[PDB]
Design a protein around this ligand. Structure first.
Ligand code: SF4
Ligand code: SF4
Ligand code: FCO
Ligand code: FCO
Ligand code: SF3
Ligand code: SF3
Ligand code: F3S
Ligand code: F3S
Ligand SMILES: [Cl-]
Ligand SMILES: [Cl-]
Ligand SMILES: [Cl-]
Ligand SMILES: [Cl-]
Ligand SMILES: [Cl-]
Ligand SMILES: [Mg+2]
Ligand SMILES: [Mg+2]
Ligand code: NI
Ligand code: NI
Lengths: 581, 262, 581, 263
């Protein structure tokens, strides 16, 4: 057993080893291992992506116009975000400028995704870490009504409603078929909600499972379907016709009316169900504002997103700020350049990939994706891993670094970047939110903080949805209908050789696609995805990524039941298919 | 007692789970609480790690011969199957163990049915559809990337209400939803018949909803319910929102040339 | 002036005349006049249908297969019921038996209509006679929540919800554009709800306006569209395919699933919003259990409806009982025969029609529709009527009688018939309803009682909806898919001369279509519609109809403000386009 | 900020057009009434009756003279000096003329107001007459169908409110947006028409597969509406999808174009 120091942590693989495989209530396949000391405190944490598909290999030789459709299938949870990054990358490479309405509709597609994804994460993925569903059976329906009405104006609060929800759960359990609730962590001492808050939470779990289906109707109108809507290089294919023959065949006033109706309902659900629930989880779990800090007080990264000026990806255009903090210096938000070879690099010394020199990091334009399953000296065998060997290669996830630094990405990262750049809305949201909880600002740099920032981002995005929709309608009032530029649709118009970067802020953090086009075909296509950053394995210096760092130093009440590990991992919203692609 | 369902996940993007929870009628909520017993599902279940595998093992033992196995994604044969690792072992082993106790298997999506995107050239992981690995069990193929939400739930209700598997075409796809082509129920077919085609994006034709054949629409060779049942509670489908069908329900559609070519 | 006695009333047209033209919050065109004595008590009531189109004339010479589509347009409120009666009539004439699934789907269409129509009537048509909308602005939101939660399990009851509803109304009226509330009777002393009940009722008005749109999705599935779904002679055109190629082109499992979802929501809304509101109006307006009795304690009529044994219209088949009561003898429910020339007859001595002898009544197989606008000695002129002359012809509505008796039809009539035939479910519903208000059973025979029975019936119909759907699914499980009989589709297969009766219970009461076919064409087509009964003018003996009787002896607080007249008329749910056709 | 005044009157009608309107899914009819327009007169929905209702009618057309939209449901009869439809003791046609004189524009809802619809079918006992044969000096937007699609009715209203103009119309005064193309030119069964795949009798194998309804009398080839694209009742169905041919209900005189089951 060895010990070394990195980023303020003492990585120590003495003591009991615990394995959580599978990690559930995530997208895709993850394994996590830890070592705990004699006080049941984590002294070593190992993040492992347990899947790979090889989209970067598959994309070679494809028509650049087709690329979005392939890379969209990196992920059905963050569905659309990879299509957006792809059309951005291809447009950047060829030099295509899209019409304003295409840009606005793309922003609507992204905002819609932020709302949907964040909502489903809060309830269906992270929720059962905080809500003791089975304890809801002990709640008083009237006291549940009282609690709900104390927290929100949301209509659905009657005693009889909560009784009906409770009764439905009771009869469900009575069947002796607990389904998705079977063999959970119910009764664990870290469940702190009173029964009434558990019943309220569970009711909201169900309401959110229902409501989330409506949000993506916006994707259906502009993009055909959800999951996996359609896009084009040059804009969007959803041609607009308001006042001419054949408007029945296009985005018309009736289609726009449907979109408006969904926007209003989406804002209302998020503002009156999710936001109060997140604050309530905060109130009953304040100690988790001091757990799972990880890299969030050290190194955070955002590329920025939502260009409000069409075809302008600069700081004055992006509504979601970009920037990097390193060394815990939040007074110096540094600019990010995705073409600079000394900035974003990926290492594979601790990953299942071949490089000519695994001691160096490769910028994505020099990226290599050559799979090499070699887990080394595991406890077990190559096909029966009892314990990964984190001293060697232990993941299908590459290790991204920014100027050699290990970074956290995602809602909390974005909140901290915007806050420290002096975004007024963000400072106000964060101050008021932490005030309501009677916690210091530093409490946001935590597992609880990740959850609170995500919730607030859903509110932010629901607001932006209306703003974008209103900008679309303003263009239509002015007779500006264009949704595609076709000037450079034909391969004959393209440079023989060119390369481009497409970047955005996906629900889980900073996303980039790096594309090289040669002779009308994809020559290279490299993706670095938010969960790649967060779930990263170690690098040649032994530096740990965001997950490993957040898990370090964490107390477990009951080693056999990994509730604390789940809480922290889930707070990052892991997307493993994304991470590996 | 509700029919036991074990839902496993191979190499995937999780689009098929996401589609399922979009169901408008019945709501996914009601499918889970009233229609089936969703007894195992990594994406949604409370239990993780050893607790989750305790459920997996007990379910497939207790309900041996009597559970439905739903499969999302597929098994890779490359690297001794360790392109997809499940509780430290190749996914394909979990698939075989789950398959052996199942009464029947649902192959959700193009992934489980055919291969989908990871099986597109050059198929780095040797991703393989379920019916090439499990050869002694009924397999209902429900293709699409993903399939339509209300088709997924409709097939479930068929199995519950009628206590039988849907009848299938020669490829194992339910006749009810896959018996006819997108192009044979497409509302733009009048334009195809008349030679009224979109020729470039956002042209006058596109703004009148003309046929997308010249923009590469693969509806003429694709079997699904998108042009009839439509998507997301009858709101739209690819063609309606102005993009040609990619052919996403068909075996090998990724490798059938550019989406924008004939 | 003149005075005479009929049916226990003293009809006296001395004294002040009041005119209400238009009657609003009804379907179509009605005028009402009354005389009031100096005690503000009505001593004379005059019911006038102020429209005519002449469908019975238009149908002559048409193909019997087309008839349903024409007569469906008698009414867009009771949409579908005329098409049902039409296909029944033509099938009876020709001798066609439909397959079970066609019968079950027709029963689903009728039950759907009962649910929808009754809901809209309660809230949008009758509601504002009982709910003081402007008084809702004075409610306390918390006390409103507490009232709603005391009455119902319905979820949407939070103080914040009622505050938001109240604030919407506040903003609506702040601009001084009161729209449909302008120049209302608000503040009238007969408005008895407290502010909290007004706000609860107003909230439910808005919820019902939204929700009603959902119910008719069942009509859209089986019948293409609502209003005015499609039908065929021989069954229904909505072919079923569950498990064969091309199910995408038929009624398939996805379509049936949509229907099921709507059924459950419909039952929920009716049981948890409309039923408790009907009882709440009851609790605050108990004197109205003694007002507007009219003919409801004398003569009531139902043909019966919802044949559960396909093609059997007998007593063992109809789920909604048929029968007639006369002379207040509720122990003698008499059988109704719609072919008997001595039973149903229409008189026109006081209507704008020509008969060879206007002192006799004509059975509809001998019916005549020969319009004759002759208001005789009005106050005013033929084109500017200040006062109708009820001693002469005063209506576009014919006067139906049953064995010479003036009858009341509709929800209260049906409730009475089923109650006195010993239908267990009706007896229990009525007993429980009247028990809940501490009222005698006789209190149902009233204006309040008509509203309470209509709400009951919505609940009954929602329950039957599920029953019929279950029967359809039972057939499909058994491989019984048939929806049409076509062996007598071709005219050449029909009798050269034949006649038929199609009858049902529309939302407003007993409906009959009498059709004669000759030489492949409609020879005669006569309709007698529920509002024809209720809104009937007088007959040669001077006998008054249901509306006129209900209005007799009514006290008015403020002669110039017809709130009491509107309450009673609205309780019968007048459909004037129906009445006149 | 004040909402556009709308006066909604009713001639000879079945009220299908009001009923369609309140079906609107987006915007909800509730929201149209509360937030988008000021529905200032409408006999079917208004609190006031009789003299109270006519005070409203008179106040509105006076106070907003030249500034309201007139929506007409149903149509005026010319027979019996107009007294086939009596409004406040007078012929409806007089109320229609008075209402029309103050209107900035008129919406003719439905086949009734547009063309005549069922009452005007042979032999037209009341001499029911479409609005544009009575009112000849005002813009009339025809929105035909029996009734029109709910979401078409509300979309035309949102167009007027959002863009502050009437929809552009075809030569018959129908909004191009929804009536520019035929049912048959956007019908999902067109592939079957093209292949000669037809329902020949009800509930035959063709019917169970959703084949074309041409041989069963479908009038989609001569009917202009949005039913095969926008569809009905929040996108749930339309006549053809549920197995009945189009009757031609959006077209002038469709009742007298022969049997619905003939070519
Ligand atoms: S859009 Fe595609 S599916 Fe539709 S008619 Fe044209 S080619 Fe066929
Ligand atoms: S069903 Fe009617 S509208 Fe559709 S293709 Fe056939 S004839 Fe044309
Ligand atoms: N959000 C998201 Fe998916 C991840 N990680 C992407 O990009
Ligand atoms: N209900 C109804 Fe209409 C009336 N009266 C019919 O029939
Ligand atoms: Fe649907 S998991 Fe998403 S990739 Fe195509 S189906 Fe697979
Ligand atoms: Fe629509 S009121 Fe009904 S009849 Fe044909 S439109 Fe008229
Ligand atoms: S791309 Fe797929 S979703 Fe349907 S329209 Fe084509 S089969
Ligand atoms: S009958 Fe009418 S509703 Fe549409 S499909 Fe034909 S125009
Ligand atoms: Cl900070
Ligand atoms: Cl699995
Ligand atoms: Cl494939
Ligand atoms: Cl009017
Ligand atoms: Cl007409
Ligand atoms: Mg990569
Ligand atoms: Mg008659
Ligand atoms: Ni993802
Ligand atoms: Ni009616």
């Amino acid at each position: 057993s060895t010990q070394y120091e990195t980023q303020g942590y003492t990585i120590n693989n003495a003591g009991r080893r615990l394995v959580v495989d599978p990690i559930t209530r995530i997208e895709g396949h993850m394994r996590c291992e830890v070592n705990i000391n004699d006080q049941n405190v984590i002294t070593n944490a190992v993040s492992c992506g347990t899947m790979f598909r090889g989209l970067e290999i598959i994309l070679q030789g494809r028509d650049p116009r087709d690329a979005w459709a392939f890379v969209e299938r990196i992920c059905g949870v963050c569905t659309g975000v990879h299509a957006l990054a792809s059309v951005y990358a291809i447009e950047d490479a060829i030099g295509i400028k899209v019409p304003d309405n295409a840009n606005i509709i793309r922003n609507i597609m992204l905002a819609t995704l932020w709302c949907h994804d964040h909502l489903v994460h809060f309830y269906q993925l992270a929720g059962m870490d905080w809500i003791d569903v089975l304890d809801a059976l002990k709640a008083d329906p009237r006291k549940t009504s009282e609690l709900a009405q104390s927290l929100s104006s949301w209509p659905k609060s009657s005693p009889g409603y909560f009784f009906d929800v409770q009764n439905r759960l009771k009869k469900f359990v009575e069947g002796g078929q607990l389904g998705i609730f079977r063999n959970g962590y119910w009764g664990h001492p870290q469940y702190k909600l009173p029964p009434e808050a558990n019943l309220m939470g569970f009711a909201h779990y169900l309401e959110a499972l229902d409501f989330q289906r409506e949000i993506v109707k916006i994707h259906a109108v502009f993009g055909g379907k959800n999951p996996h809507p359609n896009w084009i290089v040059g804009g969007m294919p959803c041609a607009i016709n308001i006042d001419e023959s054949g408007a029945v065949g296009a985005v018309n006033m009736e289609r726009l009316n449907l979109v408006q109706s969904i926007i209003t309902r989406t804002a209302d659900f998020i503002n009156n169900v999710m936001i109060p629930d997140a604050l309530a989880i905060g109130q009953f779990n304040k100690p988790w504002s001091e757990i799972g800090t990880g890299l969030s007080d050290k190194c955070v990264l955002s590329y920025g997103a939502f260009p409000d000026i069409a075809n302008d990806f600069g700081e004055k255009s992006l509504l979601m700020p970009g920037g990097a903090v390193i060394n815990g210096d939040f007074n110096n938000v540094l600019p990010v350049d995705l073409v600079d070879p000394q900035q974003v690099q990926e290492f594979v010394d601790h990953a299942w990939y071949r490089y000519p020199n695994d001691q160096v990091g490769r910028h994505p334009f020099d990226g290599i994706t050559d799979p090499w399953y070699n887990p080394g000296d595991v406890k077990g065998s190559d096909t029966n891993i009892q314990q990964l060997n984190e001293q060697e290669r232990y993941s299908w996830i590459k290790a991204p670094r920014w100027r050699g630094n290990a970074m956290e990405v995602g809602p909390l990262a974005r909140t901290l970047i915007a806050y420290h750049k002096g975004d007024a809305a963000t400072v106000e949201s964060v101050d008021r939110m932490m005030s309501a909880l009677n916690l210091p600002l530093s409490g946001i740099q935590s597992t609880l903080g990740r959850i609170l920032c995500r919730a607030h981002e859903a509110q932010w995005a629901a607001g932006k949805l209306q703003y974008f929709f209103d900008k679309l309608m303003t263009n239509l009032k002015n007779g500006n209908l264009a949704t595609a530029s076709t000037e450079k649709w034909e391969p004959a118009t393209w440079p023989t050789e060119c390369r481009g970067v497409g970047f955005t802020e996906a629900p889980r953090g900073a996303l980039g696609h790096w594309a090289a086009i040669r002779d009308g075909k994809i020559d290279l296509y490299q993706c670095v995805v938010p969960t790649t950053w967060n779930a990263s394995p170690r690098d040649p210096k032994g530096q740990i990524g965001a997950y490993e760092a957040a898990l370090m130093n964490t107390k477990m009440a009951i080693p056999e039941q990994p509730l604390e590990i789940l809480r922290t991992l889930h707070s990052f919203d892991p997307c493993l298919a994304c991470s590996t692609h | 007692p509700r029919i036991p369902v074990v839902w496993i996940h191979g190499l995937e993007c999780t689009c098929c789970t996401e589609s399922f929870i979009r169901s408008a009628h019945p709501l996914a909520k009601d499918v889970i609480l009233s229609l089936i017993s969703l007894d195992y599902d990594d994406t949604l279940m409370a239990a993780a790690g050893t607790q989750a595998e305790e459920v997996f093992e007990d379910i497939i033992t207790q309900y041996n011969g009597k559970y439905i196995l739903a499969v999302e994604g597929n098994p890779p044969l490359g690297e001794q199957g360790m392109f997809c690792i499940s509780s430290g072992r190749p996914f394909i082993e979990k698939l075989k163990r789950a398959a052996a106790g199942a009464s029947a298997i649902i192959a959700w999506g193009t992934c489980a049915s055919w291969g989908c995107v990871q099986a597109a050239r050059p198929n780095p992981t040797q991703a393989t559809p379920i019916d090439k690995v499990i050869t002694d069990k009924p397999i209902i193929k429900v293709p699409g990337c993903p399939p339509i939400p209300d088709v997924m739930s409709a097939i479930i209700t068929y199995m519950v209400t009628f206590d039988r598997l849907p009848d299938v075409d020669r490829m194992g796809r339910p006749l009810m939803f896959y018996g006819q082509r997108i192009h044979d129920k497409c509302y733009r077919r009048a334009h195809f018949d008349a030679g009224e085609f979109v020729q470039s994006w956002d042209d006058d034709a596109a703004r009148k909803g003309y046929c997308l054949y010249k923009m590469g629409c693969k509806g003429p060779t694709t079997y699904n319910a998108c042009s009839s049942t439509r998507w997301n509670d009858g709101v739209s489908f690819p063609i309606q929102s102005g993009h040609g069908c990619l052919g996403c329900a068909e075996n090998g559609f990724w490798d059938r040339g550019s989406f924008y070519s004939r």
